[PDB]
Design a protein around this ligand. Structure first.
Ligand code: CU
Ligand code: CU
Ligand code: CU
Ligand code: CU
Lengths: 77, 278
């Protein structure tokens, strides 16, 4: 049962999420239109490739954490 | 073939370690270790195939990955071994670890850029090539995202756990492996990645040379756990879908099993490892 989609501007950047050498899938996140690889843990929490050791409760929280980590930098696909 | 606590290295040992790491970077070999690690942490999943992380093979896989890296170092300078970072003891940014003669310090607050040490971008000798964003400079924020490194007391609580691992053999598991990895409990290994910050907090964490020293100490705690629990051993021991059983081979090497890696003394010893005592 996937999380709901989202779309907002967070610290000046557009973050979106939607149910769908990396893993399987389930849910997609984008930061300014560039896909952010994210992953769900068994307990329902999420991580992303920019915070891979620090679980957060939702994909929006993972998107926001990526924006905070990037400090304005574009993601690479 | 002795792995030593980083805090005890001599100036010549620090110098030779740094030079060997930089030569692996210059030759292109270093970045491929970064890429291998990223491919596994991005593919290992709690509900599917899992080998490098979030699974019982977390420990033997990183043991063999570090052995590959140590062997590559020794091809440049045979005297070099991986040192380990006991983050329960050396827990502040004024640890010698973070001095300009070794790994350099924390990142500046504007962009997290490491400004000193041999791996600072300004040296020209440490481009970040394998990356998840466009920044091409080493970053750290020591103690930024989490206040404290694990304490010795916390480490001792994890070492006391007798079972190596337990079904479902993933980030939800009870037992030693997952508590050392950090997904449950007081959190040892994951929290250290978070504490360093910068690339060490991401899938491309071997971009920071401290990766090797952190995992060398995680690997030493596995050895310490074995001595505490001579009656405990790797599990599962056969027939488990998606998980590396004891006598199954492991990707990417395909030619080695957890069973071949349980006894570190086949490859190296530590400066100090207490015997099974009671
Ligand atoms: Cu994926
Ligand atoms: Cu890892
Ligand atoms: Cu790690
Ligand atoms: Cu005994």
């Amino acid at each position: 049962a996937a999380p709901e989609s989202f779309d907002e501007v967070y610290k000046g950047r557009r973050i979106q999420g939607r149910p769908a050498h990396e893993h399987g899938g389930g849910y997609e996140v984008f930061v300014d239109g560039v896909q952010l690889h994210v992953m769900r843990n068994a307990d329902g929490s999420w991580i992303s490739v920019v915070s891979h050791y620090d679980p957060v409760p939702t994909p929006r929280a993972a998107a926001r954490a990526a924006v905070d980590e990037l400090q304005g930098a574009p993601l690479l696909p | 073939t002795v792995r030593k606590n980083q805090a005890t290295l001599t100036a010549d040992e620090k110098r030779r370690f740094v030079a060997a790491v930089l030569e692996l970077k210059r030759s292109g070999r270093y970045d491929e270790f970064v890429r291998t690690h990223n491919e596994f942490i991005m593919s290992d999943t709690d509900s599917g195939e899992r080998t490098g992380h979030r699974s019982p093979s977390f420990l033997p896989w990183h043991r063999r990955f570090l052995l590959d890296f140590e062997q590559a170092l020794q091809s440049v300078d045979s005297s070099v071994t991986l040192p380990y970072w006991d983050w329960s003891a050396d827990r502040t940014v004024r640890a010698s670890l973070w001095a300009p003669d070794f790994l350099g310090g924390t990142g500046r607050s504007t962009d997290g850029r490491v400004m000193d040490g041999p791996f600072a971008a300004s040296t020209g000798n440490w481009p970040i090539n394998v990356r998840v964003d466009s920044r091409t400079y080493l970053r750290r924020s020591l103690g930024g995202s989490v206040a404290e490194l694990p304490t010795r007391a916390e480490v001792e609580s994890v070492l006391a756990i007798s079972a190596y691992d337990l079904p479902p053999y993933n980030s939800a598991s009870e037992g030693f492996r997952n508590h050392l990895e950090g997904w449950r409990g007081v959190n040892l290994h994951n929290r250290v990645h978070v504490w360093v910050g910068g690339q060490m907090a991401t899938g491309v964490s071997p971009n920071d040379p401290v990766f090797w020293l952190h995992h060398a100490y995680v690997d030493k705690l596995w050895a310490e756990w074995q001595r505490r629990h001579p009656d405990s051993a790797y599990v599962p021991t056969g027939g488990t879908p998606d998980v590396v059983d004891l006598n199954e081979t492991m990707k990417p090497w395909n030619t080695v099993r957890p069973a071949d890696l349980l006894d570190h003394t086949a490859y190296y010893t530590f400066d100090a490892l207490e015997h099974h005592h009671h």
